[PDB]
Amino acid sequence: EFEERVVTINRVAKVVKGGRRFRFTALVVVGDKNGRVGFGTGKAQEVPEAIKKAVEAAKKDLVVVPRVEGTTPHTITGRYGSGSVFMKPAAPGTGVIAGGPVRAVLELAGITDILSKSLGSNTPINMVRATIDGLQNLKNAEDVAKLRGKTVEELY
RNA sequence: AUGGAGAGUUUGAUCCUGGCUCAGGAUGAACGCUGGCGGCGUGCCUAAUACAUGCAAGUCGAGCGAACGGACGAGAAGCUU
């Protein structure tokens, strides 16, 4: 189930010699609670198509987040442009404490044991990019030991 | 490594950069208005300004002179026994 989360409504006014438009764009985050997470937007007007074309746009790319279960396996961060996020793994019995673009990809993957020091910008585009571009750069233990050519259980 | 999200703010409309502002805590707090009872702490932060009065360091006859009062036998009676 491609779990939806909206960010905002919008209005854009292109002042010309004539008249300005009433485009109502948006941007959403679409995860699945499995470690296969996307996000999407669209220059739309319809609040359904603000979801629908963007849910279609998020289903242009669901990124593969490797999840050693129970939390996010490492103490990680994010990076895009002028913004950057941060995640520290923690206990399960906490209650998730994060924000708007830093909680979004973190809650639609079912992990719930993390931190959030959302550094960088306040523009949610490159923020939720950094929430995604950091998270896509995650790696597990078993594939890297395959990639390095050691064994999996040799790493502790 | 038990924590680390914030809210706005330069346009006709964006990104950056920037300070600024509030959301949250506390105070020997104090003030406007309010005010049940206990169980509890704290109590001139200013003038180390000036002070009436009370008033706050004494000690021991088992040191020994004194001297006083003075119980203490305490006469004859001062005969008002």
Short mmCIF file of C-alpha atoms (C1' of nucleotides) in Angstrom, two decimals:
data_model
loop_
_atom_site.label_atom_id
_atom_site.label_comp_id
_atom_site.label_asym_id
_atom_site.label_seq_id
_atom_site.Cartn_x
_atom_site.Cartn_y
_atom_site.Cartn_z
CA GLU A 1 0.00 0.00 0.00
CA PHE A 2 1.65 3.16 -1.30
CA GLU A 3 1.15 5.33 1.77
CA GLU A 4 0.31 8.96 1.01
CA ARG A 5 1.44 12.14 2.75
CA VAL A 6 0.66 15.64 1.41
CA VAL A 7 2.83 18.69 2.12
CA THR A 8 0.98 21.81 0.93
CA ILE A 9 -1.48 23.57 -1.32
CA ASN A 10 -0.22 26.33 -3.59
CA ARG A 11 -1.08 29.23 -5.87
CA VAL A 12 1.23 30.72 -8.52
CA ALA A 13 0.60 34.07 -10.23
CA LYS A 14 2.44 34.67 -13.52
CA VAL A 15 2.07 38.44 -13.90
CA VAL A 16 2.05 39.30 -17.59
CA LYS A 17 0.64 42.02 -19.84
CA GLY A 18 -2.65 40.17 -19.37
CA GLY A 19 -3.63 38.04 -16.39
CA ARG A 20 -2.03 35.77 -13.82
CA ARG A 21 -2.86 32.08 -13.58
CA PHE A 22 -4.40 30.10 -10.71
CA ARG A 23 -2.27 26.96 -10.84
CA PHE A 24 -2.59 24.96 -7.62
CA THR A 25 0.52 22.80 -7.47
CA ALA A 26 1.61 20.47 -4.67
CA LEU A 27 4.20 17.90 -3.64
CA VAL A 28 3.71 14.63 -1.74
CA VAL A 29 5.75 11.82 -0.24
CA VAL A 30 4.71 8.24 -1.02
CA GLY A 31 6.18 5.34 0.94
CA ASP A 32 5.02 1.81 1.54
CA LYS A 33 6.30 0.86 5.05
CA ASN A 34 8.74 -1.62 3.54
CA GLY A 35 11.88 0.33 2.66
CA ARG A 36 10.70 1.08 -0.89
CA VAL A 37 10.05 4.80 -0.70
CA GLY A 38 9.18 7.44 -3.29
CA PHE A 39 8.04 11.06 -3.48
CA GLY A 40 6.36 13.15 -6.14
CA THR A 41 4.95 16.50 -7.15
CA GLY A 42 3.26 18.18 -10.07
CA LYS A 43 2.30 21.50 -11.57
CA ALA A 44 -1.41 20.78 -11.33
CA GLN A 45 -4.57 22.54 -10.21
CA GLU A 46 -6.80 19.70 -9.03
CA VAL A 47 -6.24 18.73 -5.39
CA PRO A 48 -7.00 15.15 -6.55
CA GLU A 49 -4.46 15.44 -9.38
CA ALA A 50 -2.18 17.13 -6.85
CA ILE A 51 -2.21 13.69 -5.23
CA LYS A 52 -2.95 11.53 -8.28
CA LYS A 53 -0.39 12.81 -10.81
CA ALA A 54 2.15 13.03 -7.98
CA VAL A 55 1.35 9.52 -6.74
CA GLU A 56 1.92 8.61 -10.38
CA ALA A 57 5.06 10.77 -10.21
CA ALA A 58 6.18 9.00 -7.04
CA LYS A 59 5.57 5.73 -8.89
CA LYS A 60 8.04 6.87 -11.49
CA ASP A 61 10.67 6.18 -8.80
CA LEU A 62 10.37 4.26 -5.52
CA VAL A 63 13.89 4.21 -4.13
CA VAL A 64 15.24 1.10 -2.41
CA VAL A 65 16.07 1.79 1.24
CA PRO A 66 17.74 -1.25 2.82
CA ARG A 67 16.29 -1.83 6.26
CA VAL A 68 18.00 -3.89 8.86
CA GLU A 69 14.78 -4.02 10.85
CA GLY A 70 13.67 -2.44 14.13
CA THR A 71 15.19 0.94 13.23
CA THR A 72 17.42 2.43 10.65
CA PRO A 73 20.64 0.42 11.06
CA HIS A 74 23.14 3.28 11.28
CA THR A 75 23.58 6.85 12.50
CA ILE A 76 23.04 8.59 9.18
CA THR A 77 22.27 11.97 7.64
CA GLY A 78 21.12 13.58 4.39
CA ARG A 79 22.33 15.90 1.65
CA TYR A 80 20.83 17.94 -1.20
CA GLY A 81 21.74 21.46 -2.27
CA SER A 82 21.15 23.87 0.59
CA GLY A 83 19.45 21.41 2.95
CA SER A 84 20.45 18.30 4.89
CA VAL A 85 18.79 15.99 7.43
CA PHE A 86 20.12 13.74 10.21
CA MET A 87 18.99 10.44 11.76
CA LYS A 88 20.19 8.69 14.91
CA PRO A 89 18.71 5.23 15.65
CA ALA A 90 17.05 4.85 19.02
CA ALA A 91 14.57 2.86 21.11
CA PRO A 92 11.17 1.66 19.82
CA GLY A 93 9.13 2.86 22.79
CA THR A 94 9.62 6.56 22.11
CA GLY A 95 6.98 8.08 19.89
CA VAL A 96 8.31 9.48 16.62
CA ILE A 97 9.68 13.03 16.93
CA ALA A 98 10.38 14.74 13.60
CA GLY A 99 8.98 17.41 11.31
CA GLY A 100 7.41 18.05 7.92
CA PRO A 101 9.94 16.98 5.28
CA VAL A 102 12.19 15.06 7.67
CA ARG A 103 9.35 12.97 9.14
CA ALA A 104 7.75 12.26 5.77
CA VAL A 105 10.04 9.64 4.22
CA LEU A 106 10.85 8.48 7.78
CA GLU A 107 7.23 7.67 8.71
CA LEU A 108 6.07 6.12 5.44
CA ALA A 109 8.75 3.48 5.91
CA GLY A 110 7.87 1.57 9.04
CA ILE A 111 10.91 2.07 11.26
CA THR A 112 9.74 4.45 14.07
CA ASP A 113 13.06 4.35 16.02
CA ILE A 114 15.07 7.33 14.76
CA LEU A 115 16.10 10.92 15.44
CA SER A 116 15.84 14.18 13.47
CA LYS A 117 18.30 17.09 13.43
CA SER A 118 16.98 18.76 10.29
CA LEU A 119 19.87 21.05 9.45
CA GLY A 120 20.26 23.03 6.25
CA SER A 121 17.48 24.98 4.58
CA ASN A 122 13.77 25.44 5.18
CA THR A 123 12.70 24.95 1.56
CA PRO A 124 10.99 21.53 1.72
CA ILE A 125 11.98 20.59 -1.86
CA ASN A 126 15.70 20.16 -1.28
CA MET A 127 14.93 19.21 2.32
CA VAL A 128 12.81 16.21 1.36
CA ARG A 129 15.36 15.61 -1.37
CA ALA A 130 18.03 15.48 1.34
CA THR A 131 15.63 13.33 3.33
CA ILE A 132 15.60 11.01 0.31
CA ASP A 133 19.11 11.46 -1.14
CA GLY A 134 20.59 10.60 2.22
CA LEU A 135 18.22 7.68 2.70
CA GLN A 136 18.88 6.15 -0.72
CA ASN A 137 22.61 6.08 0.15
CA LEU A 138 21.88 3.63 2.97
CA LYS A 139 23.48 0.19 2.83
CA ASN A 140 22.98 -3.02 4.81
CA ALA A 141 25.61 -5.39 6.22
CA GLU A 142 25.06 -8.51 4.09
CA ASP A 143 25.41 -6.94 0.64
CA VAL A 144 28.55 -4.97 1.54
CA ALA A 145 30.22 -8.10 2.91
CA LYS A 146 29.23 -9.65 -0.41
CA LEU A 147 30.57 -6.51 -2.11
CA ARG A 148 33.77 -6.50 -0.06
CA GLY A 149 34.00 -10.26 -0.38
CA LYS A 150 34.02 -11.15 3.30
CA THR A 151 31.23 -13.12 4.98
CA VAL A 152 28.17 -11.50 6.55
CA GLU A 153 28.68 -12.56 10.17
CA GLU A 154 32.41 -11.63 10.08
CA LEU A 155 31.64 -7.94 10.68
CA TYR A 156 31.15 -7.85 14.48
"C1'" A B 1 26.16 8.53 22.52
"C1'" U B 2 17.86 8.19 25.95
"C1'" G B 3 19.12 14.26 22.70
"C1'" G B 4 19.20 17.74 18.08
"C1'" A B 5 11.57 19.04 14.58
"C1'" G B 6 10.17 24.77 15.29
"C1'" A B 7 6.43 29.63 13.48
"C1'" G B 8 7.24 33.96 10.42
"C1'" U B 9 10.01 37.53 7.77
"C1'" U B 10 13.09 40.93 1.78
"C1'" U B 11 8.33 39.81 -4.36
"C1'" G B 12 4.47 40.82 -9.14
"C1'" A B 13 6.56 35.56 -8.27
"C1'" U B 14 10.97 32.11 -6.75
"C1'" C B 15 16.24 30.13 -4.63
"C1'" C B 16 20.17 31.73 -1.47
"C1'" U B 17 22.08 34.85 2.47
"C1'" G B 18 20.93 37.53 6.59
"C1'" G B 19 19.68 39.43 11.19
"C1'" C B 20 15.20 40.07 13.75
"C1'" U B 21 10.73 37.98 16.04
"C1'" C B 22 7.59 34.51 18.84
"C1'" A B 23 6.24 29.27 20.33
"C1'" G B 24 9.31 26.15 25.54
"C1'" G B 25 11.52 26.24 30.17
"C1'" A B 26 12.79 28.49 34.68
"C1'" U B 27 13.00 33.77 38.81
"C1'" G B 28 14.86 35.55 46.22
"C1'" A B 29 10.91 37.75 40.85
"C1'" A B 30 7.48 41.80 41.28
"C1'" C B 31 2.80 43.93 39.61
"C1'" G B 32 -3.08 43.95 37.83
"C1'" C B 33 -7.07 40.83 39.23
"C1'" U B 34 -8.34 36.34 42.19
"C1'" G B 35 -8.17 33.41 46.29
"C1'" G B 36 -10.02 26.54 50.61
"C1'" C B 37 -7.07 24.11 54.07
"C1'" G B 38 -3.06 21.59 55.69
"C1'" G B 39 2.31 19.27 54.78
"C1'" C B 40 6.67 21.91 53.15
"C1'" G B 41 11.06 25.67 51.91
"C1'" U B 42 12.63 30.67 51.10
"C1'" G B 43 12.70 35.08 53.05
"C1'" C B 44 16.29 44.43 51.82
"C1'" C B 45 18.57 41.75 45.56
"C1'" U B 46 18.81 48.62 46.54
"C1'" A B 47 21.88 52.64 51.06
"C1'" A B 48 29.17 48.50 53.60
"C1'" U B 49 22.76 54.37 54.35
"C1'" A B 50 22.02 56.39 59.47
"C1'" C B 51 20.23 54.86 64.08
"C1'" A B 52 16.17 55.77 69.64
"C1'" U B 53 15.11 51.72 72.76
"C1'" G B 54 15.07 46.67 74.32
"C1'" C B 55 19.37 43.00 74.20
"C1'" A B 56 22.17 39.86 72.88
"C1'" A B 57 29.36 36.26 77.05
"C1'" G B 58 29.75 34.64 80.41
"C1'" U B 59 32.08 31.78 84.46
"C1'" C B 60 33.11 29.92 89.82
"C1'" G B 61 33.20 29.98 98.15
"C1'" A B 62 34.91 23.61 96.40
"C1'" G B 63 40.45 30.32 95.52
"C1'" C B 64 40.72 34.40 99.81
"C1'" G B 65 40.19 38.75 101.72
"C1'" A B 66 36.66 41.15 102.95
"C1'" A B 67 32.46 43.97 104.38
"C1'" C B 68 26.70 43.72 104.40
"C1'" G B 69 22.26 41.23 105.57
"C1'" G B 70 21.70 37.10 108.15
"C1'" A B 71 19.36 31.89 109.96
"C1'" C B 72 22.52 30.28 114.11
"C1'" G B 73 23.37 29.05 121.05
"C1'" A B 74 21.83 33.88 121.80
"C1'" G B 75 22.06 36.47 128.47
"C1'" A B 76 19.92 39.66 131.81
"C1'" A B 77 15.06 40.78 130.10
"C1'" G B 78 13.40 45.97 126.44
"C1'" C B 79 8.92 42.91 131.67
"C1'" U B 80 4.93 45.67 126.40
"C1'" U B 81 6.57 36.85 128.20
#
